Structures are given as structure tokens and as C-alpha cells.
């Protein structure tokens, strides 16, 4: 209950929110049913519209009007945004030549340049080019400021997950807003687009920018706007707040537009109807920039023009129905549309079985347009699993499609032609970023980057310390003229041992066998074991181990490794393959060869008997025997210290990557450096498991089974230089392949590996940073490059989408 008969007199769009049941005058009052009786009359004035005309110039102030054209309006801070243009012979901001803003040019009493976030819903990245003729204000921000060709949203590419990621720097799994609709089984409560539960603070985790600002003494304007407040009034309210006295004036502001998303749903991303919504958004930008210019703030404020996600062509006829796959469709609840999430309809049903639902959904139809996953098997790049609000069963829907439970859900709900929510690497889901202002660079293009990075930068722009988040602070320093954040490399926590030869062959009883059999070249083999080829194979220094553990560096002719005495296998294995390298096979006599490593005790080694006994598990090697530099060097590849546990189904993938794809990449990239290793993430939190979290071992042993295997593949960005003699910037691609006992994920897996393996690997593309979280390792410690540049490289994601 709100006693809605106090008054908004003088309080319109007040910044502090008053406590119930005294009535409210802030932009949230509408959605709470709590506005004072006179809120519309006083606060939502519309008389005479939003623009000055020639006859209004110098008028007598009429407090009824939406905005003013009277001589007193500038000092009141409430002129129509075109006032100086119509009445004072000034130009529109968009008609001025752009001039570098080398320093903030701010009115006296401004402690820092304000930040304005101008967010546009559903603004697909290609609109910047495709709509540029009808968006002159946006085009000027873009060409004159700092822009990316696109910005990658988070998954799912829905509104609330992405806007809250913008505000927090967090993955949806960590901030808690994991979709537009959610069931939280601890609360036993549902979050919906329509309704009131969604305002409850228990849904919203992390620390959003407005809270980070307030805690640190920086005042914030509201970020939420009630849908019924017109855009012109939102802009005028921001401009009014900017005219407050110093002690009262916010430093950070947000504008939000529901367009072009709203129309894109109805007409598709490029429907002819889409031109008008784009013109209208450009006009609003024009109003803001003209307003800033009037207030002498247009070379003082940092403006961020940013979208939450793009928009794809989707219609009703492109819907798959679970009723065509499942007998038991009435015992499930589906969250439907551009992603699927499945749970039991009733928690009393103990005949509900996720295993049988997954199987009934797997490769059942020749062109099936969704793929089911247990959430922990989703590509790790999605970071979409560690939250009780994310259902165990997930469906990744192909772009352009929907999933629904039954056909009646679709026609008792064709309306629409656009939708979004798909995999965040899909081109149609990409969105926009432009930064314009004294703190951003002038006329500068930056590579595409992820929206999880922006929180840190907005904190930098406001002199705030960011709360802990998923950005990599410093990775976007190249966007900024100043206020850079100068990170330092983390300290290594564990230093390696460098074992020499310490064990005789007969001390080992591992049940392994190998068919293995000159003074000049004897010194040669010794030098290799001490590290003589290490500068060839370890190009960027050894990775640093950032947790407490016991490990050995092991050197070889063809590869170097960091061998974990605790996990009984390398944490990492590093090797370089030049353009000229040759692929050989595993000779017949060496097919089943595993060799004890006389540097590493029996007690800290794997054994072959464990693999013999484990009928499900086989093994592979991290440095591949196929790429040995010579027949004699090939023996090193069969050391028990190079062996890792692999399901036979996974070995099909691994053997093809190692025999075919590494050489292909070296040919294409002019040499590659490869770092490969295991990952253990049994609790799917995206973070390295400790030893007491491992759920599975090679039967009868303490050999832990990896959940995933990674590789980081680096070469010279200037491919005219070989990987091992690179003078400048690096180029990287990486993957984190799920270590699965079947290839059910790949529907064409009965075919030759040349038809499906590389497709699987692309799906599981990764950032080096993702691998760092999963392993507690820190790569690229010794390069010629600046640390911020290396941070950008570590956040790079190779997407395999075309242009
Ligand atoms: C992306 O960036 C984020 C942010 O940096 C990273 O997330 C952090 O990861 C840490 C490790 O997982 C985690 O640290 C834990 O903090 C616990 C205290 O947590 C509360 O306080 C913080 C601080 O204000 C708050 O942010 C938390 O908010 C979470 O939970 C609320 C309410 O549930 C949600 O509203 C919110 O959305 C958020 O949820 C997310 O995180 C939680 C985990 O905290 C998940 O469960 C959710 O699914 C969701 O993803 C909290 O309110 C603290 O309790 C932990 O301490 C345990 O472990 C340490 C190890 O050092 C040990 O010393 C202790 O023994 C202790 O164990 C005890 O509890 C165990 C479990 O019950 C039990 O088994 C033991 O026997 C013990 O009793 C731990 O230190 C940190 O909170 C989050 N922060 C956030 C915001 O998520 C994230 O990792 C990054 N992602 C990647 C891939 O890099
Ligand atoms: C820029 C920005 C805007 C924003 O909400 C804007 C907004 N106003 N009104 C609506 C929305 C979103 N939808 C419902 C109607 C949010 C939130 C508060 C969503 C977390 C964060 C940021 Cl960073
Ligand atoms: Ca949206
Ligand atoms: Ca983990
Ligand atoms: Na076996
Ligand atoms: Na298959
Ligand atoms: Zn939408």
C-alpha cells in the first residue's frame, strides 16, 4: 500500500528513492504503482512538444511546457535540446567537423568527466554499416571516437542477462540473471519479464556499477527507465541532472532504448520497417549531443554507445517440437525459444530420468535444428553451468530456429519475424560498441571484444576500483587515451624442480613394455635433457603455476613439459612445429610402447596395468609421436611422463588433431607453437579443481581423469615470419575439448574424422584466459610485447564465423 497523496512538487525524478508508504517521484515509481497523485502532471509534461520553433524564441516562461525556449532556460538547465540552434544561430552537433578532444574541457566545479551510457536494445552490429546513411549522429560518434566492428554479448543473448553483465562485469552464471525467465529451486520462486518477483533484490547478484560508484562516493543517475516515459523526457531528465550543483550532480548516467529490438522482433533484423526505428534512435543521440553542446559539455562527457545483443530472422514455421521426440512430453517443463532448458514437471516423479530424455533428443532426425547437452558439457566458452537456476538439461538451438514443447504452444501464444538468444559467437547476435570523449582515443578502430570487459573500463573512466569480476583488467587499455590501469603479472606460487637421472629401469614395476634398444652424439642427447632445445619449444617462457603444488620441468629434444607429481601427468606440454616439419607414423614395433622416465620416481608415475584393467579407459600422449624430429627423438614421446588418460572415443578426436591438424596449422600459419594439457573441472565452475574434487580415476589407481583437454596454438601475426622468429604481435587460437566416452555430440561421427572433428573443435574454441582459470596457469610470461597487449591476446576468441 502506497498513500499516493503526498506531492512531486519540486521532486520530479528525484535521485534518492523514498521509503513506503510515502509516495515516490523517481522513474521506478510507475512499475511499483507508487507515484504521487501529480506525477504525470508535474513530471511528464508534454505541452508543445520537444522542439523550439522560431516563434517560441525568447518567450515568457510557461511552466506547463515540456521544455523551454525562454531566455532563462539555460540557467534553469531545461531548454529544448534544439534551443540554441533555433533561437541563437548555433549549429547542430552533427554538423560540426570533428576535432580531437585532447583534454577534458569541463565547466568549473566538475571533478571528473561524467560518463553517459547510451544503451540500445537489439542493436545488431551490422546496423553500424548497413544503416550508416540514416544515422548521421551515430556515424559521427563512431568515426570520430573509438569503435569496435562489433562487441560479443554473453550467452544467452537475451536482454536482462546482457544488460546486467554490462553493469557487473560478470558471467550470467555468477550474477544470477541466467535468462529472461527463471525458476530458483532454493527460493522456490519464479522470475518473469512480466510481473513483480523480478524487482526482488535476491535475483540480482554481484555489484552493479551504480552501487560500485555510490560506495566509493561517486553519485549515480538511475539506470532503469519506466517504459511509458518517452525517450525525449529521459534525455531531458539526464540534461537536467547534469545542471545540478556540484555536490548533488551525478557522475554516471544511463539512457536505455527499447528500439530497435521491439521492431526487429516484428519485422526481422533487416525488414524495410527497420529504417524508421534507426532514424529515430539517431535523432535521440542528436538530442543528447545538442543538449550537451548547449551545456558546454560536449567535449567534457565520455559517451558509450552500446547494445545488449543483435537480432536474427526467426519465424513460427522454424520451430522444432519436443512432442516429436519424447513419449513423456507432459512430465517435463521446458523454457522455450532460442534456447531450451528442461527440468521435471514434478519433483515427486522418480521415473523422470535425464539420461533417457537426452538420448531421445540426440541425433534423431537428419537435419535436427537443436542439440541437447547436460549443462556441464556445454562449450566452456559459454560459461553457462555454475548456477542452480540453470537447468541440468540444455538445448543449443541453431540460429534461425525455435524449440517448443508442443505445437499448441506456438499458435496459442504467426506474429514475429526476429528473435535472439542463440550462441554468443553467432554473427547475427553480435552488437555494437562506440566510445566518444576526452578519455577515449580519437578516430581509432579496436578489435572486437566481449561485453564482460566493459565494467572495468567504466570503473577506470570514473576513477573507481572495480568489484571482483570476469573481465581481465588492462585488456581494454588500448581503447583509452589516459586512465589506463597498469596491471602487473601475477606472482608464481610454486617453483619447479629440475630432476636429473635418479632411477634405474628395474626400480619400476609399471607393467609397461617397450621395444627399445655413439660418444659424439651421446653428449648431444644429454644436452637435450638439460634444456638445449628449450628456446625453440618454449617460446614465451614457461607458464607460471599460481597455486601451491609439486611439479617438475622435463626437457626433451622436441618438447618441454611441467609434470605434476600430484596429478601424475603434465599440467602443460610445449612444442614448436615449423612450416617445414614432417609427419611420420608410429612404427610397428613401438605401437604399445610406454617407457619409464628415469627422472621421475615409480611412486609419482602412471602405470600400464591400470589401463589394461580399466576396460573403458585407454591413453594418449600430449606431445604427439607423429611429429617427432627423428627416429631417435621419437622414443621420448613414449615416456610414461607424456601419457594421459583418454577414452577410445576421444582418441579418435585427439589422434586426428595431432596427426593432421597440427601440421595443417603449421603450414597455414608459418609454424605454430602448441601448449597442450589436461583440465579437471568436475564441479563445472570454470575453475581448476583441487585434488579432493576429482570424481573419477583410471580404475584401481590414483590417476585422475581429465574432464577436458586444451591446446593453445600461437604463431606470428605477421605470417611472413616463422612462429619461432617472430618480431612483433602474436596470433592465437585455442580450444578446450570435452573428454567424453562417446561422440554423441557429433551426429556425423561414424564418418571419417575429416568430416566432423574440426567442426567439433570449432564449437569448443576458447580464450587463453578460459584455460588460465581452468588450470591456475599464467601463459606468455616472457615475450617482447607490452603486458596490456598480452592481456588482449589472452582474451581473444577465434570464432570461425565468416565476415
Ligand atoms: C567470475 O567472477 C566472479 C567474481 O570474482 C567469480 O566468482 C567468485 O568465485 C569464488 C569461488 O567460487 C567465490 O568465493 C566464495 O565466496 C563465498 C562467499 O560468498 C558470498 O559473498 C560474496 C561477496 O559479497 C557474494 O558475491 C556471493 O554471491 C553469490 O551468491 C549469492 C547468493 O547465493 C548470489 O546472489 C550471487 O549471484 C553469487 O552467486 C554465484 O556464486 C556462488 C558462490 O559464491 C555460486 O554458488 C552461485 O552459483 C553463483 O554462481 C555470496 O553471497 C564463500 O562462502 C566461499 O568460501 C568457501 O571456499 C573457500 C575456498 O577458499 C574455503 O576457504 C571455505 O571453506 C568455504 O567453504 C565453505 O563452504 C563450502 C560450500 O558451501 C563448504 O563445502 C565448506 O565445507 C565450507 O563450509 C568462497 O570463497 C565468490 O563468492 C564468487 N563471487 C561471485 C560474485 O560469484 C567467478 O569465479 C568468476 N568466474 C570465472 C570462470 O573465472
Ligand atoms: C545501461 C543499462 C540499462 C539497464 O536497464 C535499462 C532498462 N530501463 N528500462 C527497462 C530496461 C531493461 N528492460 C526492462 C525495461 C540495466 C538493468 C537495470 C536492466 C540491469 C543495466 C544497464 Cl548497464
Ligand atoms: Ca535486449
Ligand atoms: Ca572446478
Ligand atoms: Na583400457
Ligand atoms: Na556420434
Ligand atoms: Zn528482444
Swiss-Prot record:
PTM comment text: N-glycosylation, but not furin-cleavage, plays a critical role on secretion and on lysoPLD activity. The interdomain disulfide bond between Cys-363 and Cys-747 is essential for catalytic activity.
Active site: 159
Enzyme class: hydrolase
Impact when changing residue 159 to A: Abolishes lysophospholipase D activity
Keywords per UniProt: Calcium, Chemotaxis, Cleavage on pair of basic residues, Disulfide bond, Glycoprotein, Hydrolase, Lipid degradation, Lipid metabolism, Metal-binding, Obesity, Repeat, Secreted, Signal, Zinc
Binding site for 1-hexadecanoyl-sn-glycero-3-phosphate: 159, 180, 261, 420
The keyword Ligase is annotated on this UniProt entry: no
Catalytic activity: a 1-O-alkyl-sn-glycero-3-phosphoethanolamine + H2O = a 1-O-alkyl-sn-glycero-3-phosphate + ethanolamine + H(+); a 1-acyl-sn-glycero-3-phosphoethanolamine + H2O = a 1-acyl-sn-glycero-3-phosphate + ethanolamine + H(+); 1-(9Z-octadecenoyl)-sn-glycero-3-phosphoethanolamine + H2O = 1-(9Z-octadecenoyl)-sn-glycero-3-phosphate + ethanolamine + H(+); a 1-O-alkyl-sn-glycero-3-phosphocholine + H2O = a 1-O-alkyl-sn-glycero-3-phosphate + choline + H(+)
Binding site for 1-tetradecanoyl-sn-glycerol 3-phosphate: 159, 180, 261, 420
Impact after mutating residue 380 to A: Impaired secretion. No effect on lysophospholipase activity
Cell compartment(s), UniProt: Secreted
Disulfide bonds listed in the record: 8-25, 12-43, 23-36, 29-35, 52-69, 57-87, 67-80, 73-79, 98-144, 106-300, 316-414, 363-747, 512-608, 514-593, 716-726
Domain SMB: 4-47, 48-92
Domain remark from Swiss-Prot or TrEMBL: The nuclease-like domain is most probably catalytically inactive as residues that are essential for catalysis in the DNA/RNA non-specific endonucleases are not conserved. However, it is required for the stability of the protein and the catalytic activity born by the Phosphodiesterase domain.
Name under which the protein is recorded: Autotaxin
Gene: Enpp2
Amino acid at each position: 500500500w502506497t498513500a499516493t497523496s503526498g506531492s512531486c512538487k519540486g521532486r520530479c525524478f528525484e535521485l534518492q528513492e523514498v521509503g513506503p508508504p510515502d509516495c515516490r517521484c523517481d522513474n521506478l515509481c510507475k512499475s511499483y504503482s507508487s507515484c504521487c497523485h501529480d506525477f504525470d502532471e508535474l513530471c511528464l509534461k508534454t505541452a508543445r512538444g520537444w522542439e523550439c520553433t522560431k516563434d517560441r524564441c525568447g518567450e515568457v516562461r510557461n511552466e506547463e511546457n515540456a521544455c523551454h525556449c525562454s531566455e532563462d532556460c539555460l540557467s534553469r538547465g531545461d531548454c529544448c535540446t534544439n534551443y540554441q540552434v533555433v533561437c541563437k544561430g548555433e549549429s547542430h552537433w552533427v554538423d560540426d567537423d570533428c576535432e580531437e578532444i585532447k583534454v577534458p574541457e569541463c565547466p568549473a566545479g566538475f571533478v571528473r568527466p561524467p560518463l553517459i551510457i547510451f544503451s540500445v536494445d537489439g542493436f545488431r552490429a551490422s546496423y553500424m554499416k548497413k544503416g550508416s546513411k540514416v544515422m548521421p549522429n551515430i556515424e559521427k560518434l563512431r568515426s570520430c571516437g573509438t569503435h569496435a566492428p562489433y562487441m560479443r554479448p554473453v550467452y544467452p543473448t537475451k536482454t536482462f542477462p546482457n544488460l546486467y553483465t554490462l553493469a557487473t562485469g560478470l558471467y550470467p552464471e555468477s550474477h544470477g540473471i541466467v535468462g529472461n525467465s527463471m525458476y530458483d529451486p532454493v527460493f522456490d520462486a519464479s522470475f518473469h519479464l512480466r510481473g513483480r518477483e523480478k524487482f526482488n533484490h535476491r535475483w540480482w547478484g554481484g555489484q552493479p556499477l551504480w552501487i560500485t560508484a555510490t560506495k566509493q562516493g561517486v553519485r549515480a543517475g538511475t539506470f532503469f527507465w519506466s517504459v511509458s516515459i518517452p525517450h525525449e523526457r529521459r534525455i531531458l531528465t539526464i540534461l537536467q541532472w547534469l545542471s545540478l550543483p556540484d555536490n548533488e550532480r551525478p557522475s554516471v548516467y544511463a539512457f536505455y532504448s527499447e528500439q530497435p529490438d521491439f521492431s526487429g522482433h516484428k519485422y526481422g533484423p533487416f525488414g524495410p520497417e527497420m529504417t524508421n526505428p534507426l532514424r529515430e534512435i539517431d535523432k535521440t543521440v542528436g538530442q543528447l549531443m545538442d543538449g550537451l553542446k548547449q551545456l558546454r559539455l560536449h567535449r567534457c562527457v565520455n559517451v558509450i554507445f552500446v547494445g545488449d545483443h543483435g537480432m536474427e530472422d526467426v519465424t513460427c514455421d522454424r520451430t522444432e517440437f519436443l512432442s516429436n521426440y519424447l513419449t513423456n512430453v507432459d512430465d517435463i517443463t521446458l523454457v522455450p525459444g532460442t534456447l531450451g532448458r528442461i527440468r521435471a514437471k514434478s519433483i515427486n516423479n522418480s521415473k523422470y530420468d535425464p539420461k533417457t530424455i537426452i538420448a531421445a533428443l540426440t541425433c534423431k532426425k537428419p537435419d535436427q535444428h537443436f542439440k541437447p547437452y547436460m549443462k556441464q558439457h556445454l562449450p566452456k566458452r559459454l560459461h553457462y553451468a555454475n548456477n542452480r537456476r540453470i537447468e541440468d538439461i540444455h538445448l543449443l538451438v541453431d540460429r534461425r530456429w525455435h524449440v517448443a514443447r508442443k505445437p499448441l504452444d506456438v499458435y496459442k501464444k504467426c506474429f514475429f519475424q526476429g528473435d535472439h538468444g542463440f550462441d554468443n559467437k553467432v554473427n547475427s547476435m553480435q552488437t555494437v560498441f562506440v566510445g566518444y570523449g576526452p578519455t577515449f582515443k580519437y578516430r581509432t578502430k579496436v578489435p572486437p571484444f566481449e561485453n564482460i570487459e566493459l565494467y572495468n573500463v567504466m570503473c577506470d573512466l570514473l576513477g573507481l576500483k572495480p568489484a571482483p569480476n570476469n573481465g581481465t583488467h588492462g585488456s581494454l587499455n588500448h581503447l583509452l587515451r589516459t586512465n589506463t590501469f597498469r596491471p602487473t603479472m601475477p606472482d608464481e606460487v610454486s617453483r619447479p624442480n629440475y630432476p636429473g637421472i635418479m632411477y634405474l629401469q628395474s626400480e619400476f614395476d609399471l607393467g609397461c613394455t617397450c621395444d627399445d634398444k655413439n660418444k659424439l652424439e651421446e653428449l648431444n642427447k644429454r644436452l637435450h635433457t638439460k634444456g638445449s632445445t628449450k628456446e625453440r619449444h618454449l617460446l614465451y617462457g614457461r607458464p607460471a603455476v599460481l597455486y601451491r603444488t609439486s611439479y617438475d620441468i622435463l626437457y626433451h629434444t622436441d618438447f618441454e613439459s611441467g609434470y605434476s607429481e600430484i596429478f601424475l601427468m603434465p599440467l602443460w606440454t610445449s612444442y614448436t612445429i615449423s612450416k617445414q616439419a614432417e609427419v611420420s607414423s608410429i612404427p610397428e614395433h613401438l605401437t604399445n610402447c610406454v617407457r619409464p622416465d628415469v627422472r621421475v620416481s615409480p611412486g609419482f608415475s602412471q602405470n600400464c596395468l591400470a589401463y589394461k584393467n580399466d576396460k573403458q579407459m585407454s591413453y594418449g600422449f600430449l606431445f604427439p609421436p607423429y611429429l617427432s624430429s627423428s627416429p631417435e627423438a621419437k622414443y621420448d614421446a613414449f615416456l610414461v611422463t607424456n601419457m594421459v588418460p583418454m577414452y577410445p572415443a576421444f582418441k579418435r578426436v585427439w589422434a586426428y588433431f595431432q596427426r593432421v591438424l597440427v601440421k595443417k596449422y603449421a603450414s597455414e600459419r608459418n609454424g605454430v607453437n602448441v601448449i597442450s594439457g589436461p583440465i579437471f573441472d568436475y564441479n563445472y565452475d570454470g575453475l581448476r579443481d583441487t585434488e579432493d574434487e576429482i570424481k573419477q580415476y583410471v580404475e584401481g589407481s590414483s590417476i585422475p581423469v581429465p574432464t577436458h583437454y586444451y591446446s593453445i596454438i600461437t604463431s606470428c601475426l605477421d605470417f611472413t615470419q616463422p612462429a619461432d622468429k617472430c618480431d612483433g604481435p602474436l596470433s592465437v587460437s585455442s580450444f578446450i575439448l570435452p573428454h567424453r566416452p562417446d561422440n554423441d555430440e557429433s551426429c556425423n561421427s561414424s564418418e571419417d574424422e575429416s568430416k566432423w572433428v574440426e567442426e567439433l573443435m570449432k564449437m569448443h574454441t576458447a580464450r587463453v584466459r578460459d584455460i588460465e582459470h581452468l588450470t591456475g596457469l599464467d601463459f606468455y610470461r616472457k615475450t617482447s610485447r607490452s603486458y596490456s597487449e598480452i592481456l588482449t591476446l589472452k582474451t581473444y576468441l577465434h570464432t570461425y564465423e565468416s565476415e
